[PDB]
Design a protein around this ligand. Sequence first.
Ligand SMILES: Nc1nc2c(ncn2[C@@H]2O[C@H](COP(=O)(O)OP(=O)(O)OP(=O)(O)O)[C@@H](O)[C@H]2O)c(=O)[nH]1
Ligand SMILES: [Mg+2]
Lengths: 170, 1069
Amino acid sequence: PQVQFKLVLVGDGGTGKTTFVKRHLTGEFEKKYVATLGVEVHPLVFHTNRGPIKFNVWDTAGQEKFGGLRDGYYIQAQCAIIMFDVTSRVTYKNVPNWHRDLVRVCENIPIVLCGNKVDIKDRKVKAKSIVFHRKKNLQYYDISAKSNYNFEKPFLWLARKLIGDPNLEF
Amino acid sequence: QVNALCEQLVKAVTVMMDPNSTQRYRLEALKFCEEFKEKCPICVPCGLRLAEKTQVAIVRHFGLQILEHVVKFRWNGMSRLEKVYLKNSVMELIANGTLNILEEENHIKDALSRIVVEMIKREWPQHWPDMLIELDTLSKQGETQTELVMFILLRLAEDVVTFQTLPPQRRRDIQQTLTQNMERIFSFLLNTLQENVNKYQQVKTDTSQESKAQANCRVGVAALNTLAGYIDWVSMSHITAENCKLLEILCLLLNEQELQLGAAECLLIAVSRKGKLEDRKPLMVLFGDVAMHYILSAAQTADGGGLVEKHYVFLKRLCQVLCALGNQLCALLGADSDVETPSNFGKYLESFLAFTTHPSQFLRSSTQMTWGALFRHEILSRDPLLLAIIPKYLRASMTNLVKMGFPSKTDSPSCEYSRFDFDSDEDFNAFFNSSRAQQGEVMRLACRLDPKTSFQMAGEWLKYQLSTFSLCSVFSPSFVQWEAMTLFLESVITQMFRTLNREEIPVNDGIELLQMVLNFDTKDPLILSCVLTNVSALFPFVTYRPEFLPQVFSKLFSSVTFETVEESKAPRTRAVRNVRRHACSSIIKMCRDYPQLVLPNFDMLYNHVKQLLSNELLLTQMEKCALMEALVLISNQFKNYERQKVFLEELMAPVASIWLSQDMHRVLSDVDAFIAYVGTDQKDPGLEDPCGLNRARMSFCVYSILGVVKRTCWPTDLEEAKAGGFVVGYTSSGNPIFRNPCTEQILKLLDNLLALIRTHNTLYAPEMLAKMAEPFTKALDMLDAEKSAILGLPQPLLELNDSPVFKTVLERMQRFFSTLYENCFHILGKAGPSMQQDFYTVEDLATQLLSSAFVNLNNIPDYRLRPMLRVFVKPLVLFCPPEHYEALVSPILGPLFTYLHMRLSQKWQVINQRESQEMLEEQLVRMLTREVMDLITVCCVSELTDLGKCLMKHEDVCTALLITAFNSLAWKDTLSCQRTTSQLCWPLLKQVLSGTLLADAVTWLFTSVLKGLQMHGQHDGCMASLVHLAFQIYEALRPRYLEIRAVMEQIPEIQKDSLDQFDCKLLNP
Ligand SMILES: Nc1nc2c(ncn2[C@@H]2O[C@H](COP(=O)(O)OP(=O)(O)OP(=O)(O)O)[C@@H](O)[C@H]2O)c(=O)[nH]1
Ligand SMILES: [Mg+2]
């Protein structure tokens, strides 16, 4: 554990981000949806060719009634992950909101946009409809907490951006 | 008391902002905080206490957030004096309640601006008219308050205009008021940017006072970041106000490191705005002297030397600016409005080319689209400036065709930039392939605008390639530059012979190059493939010097039998196989495009192919029958029905002998004889020689017949057509009728061909598929390469020199069966247009096709049914003349459309109920559905066609057609429902409106359109078009049939009282 990075995990309610971090930490899939109350911080240690890197991920509540100090959770954040659902188009509709609140507090930090639940058959958000990451110069990844598809790609891209080494690998 | 509560709040927020805190403690503190915000009566004094500079930034942010919360949720529960106290409190927090610009955290500025924004959204215009004057008199105090005002204006514009986080009443009020005060607002922003950039530049280089500069600079940035929040939607009147001062200052700031990114962002959002072309006309001021001066200066800093992240991100932003600007010029000039070629149009090009010659692949690939839009413009392609910049663009494009810049390698300076733009070599590989396919067309346009210098560069690149440089080559720099040079040369030549006249083409240089490529010899497969593509590209020059005909042949036919230094020791490689196949293809193209030049050599060529096929084991079947295709392509130049017929019968005599033998008949008609003769009978399981030669002979027959039906033709000119005996007569419309020399030979093989197709379809039955041994029980499957080909997933290139041969014998079998299927149905597809009358007038041919072509469709897979429809059915019906529609097309299309409809219904049923083994099949369902709907649409509607009407005038085909069309709206495919409702359904119903309609199939129909409304629903297109269709159906069928009103009654949350009014007005005349 050489260095820590603050990573803020935001998105609409029900996009699957608590299930994402829970799957990273414990390898367990929670079928039931229990909304986060405020924020839940979890540690994620990765072992790289440059040594161990720690990610303090602040898993944010996506719903307004259950948000705590929402933008207050972004304070001193070094990287961000905005997550939306490929089953609900409204999540991708609200991605720019989360991005604006993120950038207003944390200027010039690496942010990854993730489309969760790619494993489902009916995909309401076509891959060609995703242009916002190119619009704000963000990296995009199709992910699935259940399928583990592109599991570490957001964390790996964020780590490469923070450390500044394109050849960084887990 | 306030202070005790404030200490408690400090404890709570301190606990919540600690990552190592326990969850129980977090929920206690958060619950206490939310309850406090909800029902506390001293929230405002507490929040003001916490937001004071003496506190930790976390605490101050929490208090400011408390104020934002009481404005956001408890504003309607507050008195007027309370609201005034809070407003003046936060206003004086702006005045003197914060730290300096350089010392204050951005989350504190955001937290403070959020409150003011929220109060504005609560009551700006009616209850707070002096708000803008208060932000102005606040901004005049210092640059801190100015930055805060920038925050407020930005978040306000975002909240009301972009995100619309307001009630539409207040949203329209505030947006209207903004539109009214836009001149004053943009005046404040522009004046602030001007004066602060002056204050910064005056102290830009000064060690005595840096904090001053960093102050003004940080405000100048902020202004820009707030300007970008207005430019996209504000009326163009303010963007160009004060003689486009905003755009000129914006261009000047492109050369300021601290401000270049923001100014480039504002320029991008200003040059990307859409709407009326007259409203985009003022954007041509960016081509002005000062604007193009600063833009060119900023672009000229793209030296490509080293990668600095800041500078490179700026370069990508500016690149987007130049791209969108070019698109704007191409859009305005094409309308022929009062817009002229800019006075500095050269400078822009010089700037744009700076990104074309840059090492970054992403920059050039981004440039390609605007280059293409530029090279096809009717006014700009004739401009001397573009015609003068085109050679340098061609050079840069040559540097683009070469596959350099892998993130792993370090060959070219591009590599580092790839490491910054792509995760791995694979993403860069796909990006490079797409950008190359795009580059081909724009490169072709460049070759159209200047063929001579393009020919010079292509030829000189060819000479340089000829004289330069696992002992063979595998995707080395040599092969990569050979492929780039080959693509460039092929395109340049093919386009030059398209644009230049026969008098303008520099023959001597071309034939010189061709000689140079012929003398060049290599034992490496890949390089030899590039060589054969080069001579195949240079071949049009031999028209002027036919004496090179033999040497050309010597280069091609030799490569047909090319092998490595080892022949029978090692298995055949994909590379050498691609050299032989590529040579055969070059011979086919050669004989097809220039048959009058090869006709004198027909004797030597015929005897050469004869000797080549003397050994049944020498060449592959594709090679043999490819050479035969070339032979008949030359024979088409006899222009004599009898002579061509005799040559074709003589050439096909061996194939007809093998095909029409009793043993071949018994093997093609019976299933057991076929499965035993093919090799699926037994598991030495590793030897595929026992029946592989058999499969090779059958494939030889099929390939041969296909090539004959495909390459045989009558003369194009009518006088030469009837002069040789091809014209049988003329249609009642005057169109000529021809007979094909190959007809009598193919028709005698047609029956055994149909028997083979019948057996092949019968094989897919589960009791027939069970015959094959377990290693062969999956031989009729889809190849993994085909699976990953349709599934979109690309695989890294298996290096064609080693591990090349398909080592799986099962894969060999799958290739055999797939090729046999597509080839047989290819013959049945080509047969129509080649032998029109005689193929469409065969006795009982439709009954035979139903007996063989469609015998076991129930068990035929989707990946086999789709190539049957695209490859056989569509050309069969689209080339059949109307004289046989009743005879052929209708009896086949009836049961075909019925079965297709039913199958798609059940399969989509399997779809709606819901690793890659099942994800692939779904995509197969989608694409097969697209092919079927396109077959019905191209087959019926143009509205209707004589074939559409004729099929409609028949009972079965009409029913199956309409049922397919209407129940297709229930599939989970939107792009298809939009086309189906508008182009398919209503011509059908309109064609069957007059007459009897079923008493309840109307209910099934309207209910099917309702299913279409339930499935898609939200997609504006199929919602509008489906609603229109159902509206036409109800207004056209309710007065005649009462059963629909109940179907309307079952609709959720429909009112009967207005329904009765709708029907009442419906009955009225
Ligand atoms: N099929 C599928 N379901 C998923 C996937 N990821 C999450 N889900 C489901 O989506 C639900 C979302 O649960 P949460 O992760 O707690 O919701 P959230 O996105 O974190 O939003 P919050 O309410 O703020 O916690 C879970 O109940 C999961 O079952 C996925 O990758 N595939
Ligand atoms: Mg959560």
